[PDB]
Design a protein around this ligand. Structure first.
Ligand SMILES: Nc1ncnc2c1ncn2[C@@H]1O[C@H](COP(=O)(O)OP(=O)(O)O)[C@@H](O)[C@H]1O
Ligand SMILES: [Cl-]
Ligand SMILES: [Cl-]
Ligand SMILES: [K+]
Ligand SMILES: [K+]
Ligand SMILES: [Mg+2]
Length: 378
């Protein structure tokens, strides 16, 4: 005690603690309220979180991410086989179970998805401990509503391995609803829609709540649609631009491309608050610095189809839950990408002006709710 709530995300993780009737989303050593779900291995050290993602551009082969896409799955799993082709790191088969293989201290090593995730959870545990100044043992860890028993078990084992006593594994959409106090009873059932657009995945969940009891009515989405896909649309736009100004194509320079992606990710976040953003990279390619800018309008155009497409899963979820737009009582935004003004307009317009629950940072909502539940179960 106190117990913490941890959002073990696909690309970022977040930890919160409920004290004095208030949730505190804890900042890490670098002052960030969310931490990259990354782990890197080098000749001399093991890096986790910011430290790991900061050097991803120079060490692509031994920097692991997306462990959540593998957790709880068999090697023969069709999604595992498809995802592997896209990762810069190796995934090997050990007795039918996937393991990421990397070089660490000059030796080849392999880790199960739950081991990689235990490293991320340990980082989150220490982040909470640095803030509380006390040991953290109990925690509630969240998982996507569609996770099966094996995936839930593997996520719980990741916690155990990190030295945490997992009080319970709860669904991400439910945690988000708890963050907004939507689990209080005041009569009949309420239908809540969770629009979750993160860095790597997208999901829409319709829940029915009555007497503090949740019932997942339907789920929809795209496990391969996230903010990183919006960053890629920007990267290509600028590769084309750097090519025009300098008659040089940087596409085959993996590092330059990853560094440009990072600059775009940062510009994108700025565009959610401002109408323009400046990109300034020193020595991008062959010593040439890239100093340019991009407007919100242009950013939105480069992603118009992807943004608009988020509405299909919304219609399907409603259809499968056998509900009409009008029957949705609350709409909750989760995922850092839901901070994009154009996405809020699309969703809002689709729901004919209905207001969105968005006062809690979308990329913090899951951790926020998990922290509340952790205190309750504690
Ligand atoms: N202010 C923002 N505007 C636009 N996108 C954001 C903002 N903040 C975070 N994001 C995006 O949210 C994504 C990842 O964070 P979330 O917190 O969404 O992580 P996860 O993918 O693990 O659920 C990234 O694509 C990131 O760029
Ligand atoms: Cl840290
Ligand atoms: Cl629009
Ligand atoms: K997250
Ligand atoms: K998501
Ligand atoms: Mg998420």
């Amino acid at each position: 005690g106190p117990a913490v709530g941890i959002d073990l995300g696909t690309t970022y993780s977040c930890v919160g603690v409920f004290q004095h009737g208030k949730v505190e989303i804890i900042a890490n050593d670098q002052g960030n309220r969310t931490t990259p779900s990354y782990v890197a291995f080098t000749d001399t050290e093991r890096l986790i979180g910011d430290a790991a993602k900061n050097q991803v551009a120079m060490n692509p082969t031994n920097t692991v991410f997306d462990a959540k896409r593998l957790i709880g799955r068999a090697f023969d799993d069709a999604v595992v086989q498809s995802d592997m082709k896209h990762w810069p790191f190796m995934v090997v088969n050990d007795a039918g179970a996937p393991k990421v293989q990397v070089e660490y201290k000059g030796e080849t090593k392999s880790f199960y998805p739950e081991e990689v995730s235990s490293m991320v959870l340990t980082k989150m545990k220490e982040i909470a401990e640095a803030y509380l100044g006390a040991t953290v043992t109990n925690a509630v860890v969240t998982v996507p509503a569609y996770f099966n028993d094996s995936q839930r078990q593997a996520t719980k084992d990741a916690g155990t391995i990190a030295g945490l006593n997992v009080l319970r594994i709860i669904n991400e959409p439910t945690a988000a609803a708890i963050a907004y106090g939507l689990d209080k009873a005041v009569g009949a059932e309420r239908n809540v829609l969770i629009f979750d657009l993160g860095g790597g995945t997208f999901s829409v969940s319709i829940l029915t709540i009555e007497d503090g009891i949740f019932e997942v009515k339907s789920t929809a989405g795209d496990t391969h649609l996230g903010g990183e896909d919006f960053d890629n649309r920007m990267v290509n736009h600028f590769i084309a631009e750097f090519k025009r100004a300098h008659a040089k194509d940087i596409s085959e320079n993996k590092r330059a491309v990853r560094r440009l992606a990072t600059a775009c990710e940062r510009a994108k976040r700025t565009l959610s608050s401002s109408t323009q953003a400046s990109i300034e990279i020193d020595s991008l390619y062959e010593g040439i610095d890239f100093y340019t800018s991009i407007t919100r309008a242009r950013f939105e155009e480069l992603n118009a189809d992807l943004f608009r497409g988020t509405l299909d899963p919304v219609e399907k979820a409603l259809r499968d839950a056998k509900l009409d737009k009008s029957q949705i009582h609350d709409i909750v935004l989760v995922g850092g990408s839901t901070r994009i003004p154009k996405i809020q307009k699309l969703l809002q317009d689709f729901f004919n002006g209905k207001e969105l629950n968005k006062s809690i940072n979308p990329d913090e909502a899951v951790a926020y709710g998990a922290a509340v539940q952790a205190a309750i179960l504690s």
